[PDB]
Design a protein around this ligand. Structure first.
Ligand code: NA
Length: 121
């Protein structure tokens, strides 16, 4: 059907906007602390602490599989990156501090992307 195609054109355009947003969020992590999943060889107990790990590469694979249905789902995964870090790492650490900075700087980017998604349907 022609209806399934136009949804696919919307999903495709959602995916392209989310891709740009992802690049902007990841630029606020120049140290690349959140680039890849936490290593289970290097933190073997990590899954006893954190039940839903998340990182930018895992968000990228999902994005390119057009597995974000909307901005909310995308934001949930972004928030996981931050919230996982701020639980696992103590306050006086480079890791916790980097999440705080990514959170604050990302909110500007997520604030405008919420408007562009409401605007462009
Ligand atoms: Na903690």
């Amino acid at each position: 059907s022609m209806e399934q195609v136009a949804m696919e054109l919307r999903l495709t355009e959602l995916t392209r906007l989310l891709r740009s947003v992802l690049d902007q969020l990841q630029d606020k992590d120049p140290a690349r602390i959140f680039a890849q999943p936490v290593s289970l060889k290097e933190v073997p107990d990590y899954l006893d602490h954190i039940k839903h790990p998340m990182d930018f590469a895992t968000m990228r694979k999902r994005l390119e599989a057009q597995g974000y249905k909307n901005l909310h789902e995308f934001e949930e995964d972004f928030d996981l990156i931050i919230d996982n870090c701020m639980k696992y790492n103590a306050r006086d650490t480079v890791f916790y501090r980097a999440a705080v900075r990514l959170r604050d700087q990302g909110g500007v980017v997520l604030r405008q992307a919420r408007r562009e998604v409401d605007s462009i349907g």
